[model samples]
Target: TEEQIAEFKEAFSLFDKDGDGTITTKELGTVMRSLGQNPTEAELQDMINEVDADGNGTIDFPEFLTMMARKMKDTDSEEEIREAFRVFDKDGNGYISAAELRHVMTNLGEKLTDEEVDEMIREANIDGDGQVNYEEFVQMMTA
Candidate 1:
């Protein structure tokens, strides 16, 4: 949970381009483009509906947190997961490698072992490709 918070903040930062501590529609639009998605006006409003509690047409930290919680809970969309994967995959590898998962676990104060990390990956690596793709990561998280 804590690690996901960190990852969420990191992603929020990616769109908070001006570092103003909040994400504007335009900033979100820009990120959508970067992620190979065209952000039209209709989509922008839809995003705000999910995150903008005060409906200010922007997303702040708390709004982002709540949105992430809801999305991960009841809004299990592959598109959303893939976007999150891009955030977790700092190198844009389309997979979250063992080291990255280990780092997140460690950062969240989880005392997991190297063998444990390997085993975690092994269990979640559904494709047996040595890494968790977005799909596998979703299964791992949801499981």
Candidate 2:
């Protein structure tokens, strides 16, 4: 609905926080928490590293909008999103194992405690599978 669009815009604006027309790691963390999602500091850093254009350590409105559009298009179909998540899951165990997550984080040069990883896994794992599949991953991002 048009109203929803406006509402989302407002939400986005608020999420941008400092009104600097960009979202920093802190801002993203606040927004994610407010949305009842928990993303690890490493995960949040990775997101910014991958998505922040201009290398400003933040996501400008344009960059964020572009990422959102691309993500929506990429995950347009439920099946596609599921497949994408499976790719990340690595072991095809229908969920992401801690080892898999740890490997990825390690590759990113971020070390995490088992407990911290578990917390992140729990938050992102929407299906109660102790791992996050692709659909749940996408849903987490959108949420």
Candidate 3:
């Protein structure tokens, strides 16, 4: 909703460290990291330029708002999905193997049988690699 703009404004204020009414690339990177999304220098520059309407090599309030409007639209949903995966990825090794899945479900008190777990993994393990990687998990979730 339009209320997102208010939230963005709050973040913009926090990220615009000097209160300069503008967000430099560093500020941009800071905000991205705060949102749990990191961008490399090259990628970050590209994103800034994409919405940097003034061509000042910095993002002013309006530019930041526009960039955030686009970001919050789809990226927020993707992050939500990723966070769900993060819960099951207990090992922090990037993928959800059978062991991790079994552990997580039991921890959540679901207690799935081996057959049920196998079936669930089969549906999510799109490439037949026997593990549900991030891409596979996202597909399983959104599909």
Candidate 4:
């Protein structure tokens, strides 16, 4: 894994726009947008705080590769799950309706009663639309 780490170090050099061997929040945010993750301000802040271990509001060399790499991993997994959900989203409405989950839903185990599904929807529904959307599924999984 030394090469993996060495590759990271080499990557650290490429993004170091200030030639500082470190990158700032703006730099990271720009990078995120370029990578097509649609980095919101809140997301950008979370991304920076996750890697800016020195509390200097910037990322040093070691954390550089770790940051965006982890960021991509997170987004990659999230998008993968979202894409997979398309199968369950039968009507293509982007939500697994009551009729839809009769198929691909693993549910909450133990037969997944309607009451439990309602409970999960309550916990997962960020928009409070009374249904589990993709973002809500992500929040639920992370939570």
How far off is residue 133 in model 2, in Å? Answer: 13
Write down the worst ten-residue block by lDDT for model 2.
3-12
* Candidate 2 deviant stretches above 4 angstroms: 1-8, 79-143
lDDT of 1 by residue, 1-143 (tens): 78978998897899899998898888888989999999798888787777788877788998988777777766556667666677667677788888887777887799787888899899989889899888898887667
lDDT digits (tens) for residues 6-123 of candidate 4: 8777777655766777777677676667788677777777877888877888788766766657787878887888876787677888786655564455652446667766776676
Per-model CA lDDT versus the true structure: 0.82, 0.77, 0.86, 0.72
lDDT comparison, 2 vs 4, better candidate: 2
The residue pairs found clashing in candidate 1 are none
Report the CA-based lDDT of candidate 2 relative to the real structure: 0.77
Q: Worst lDDT window (10 residues) for model 4?
A: 102-111
Error of 2 at 136 (Å): 17
Question: Top model by TM-score, which number?
Answer: 4
Candidate 3 per-residue lDDT over residues 20-63, each given as its tens digit: 88878788788889899998989889977888897989888788
**Which segments of candidate 3 are over 4 A away from where they belong?**
1-70
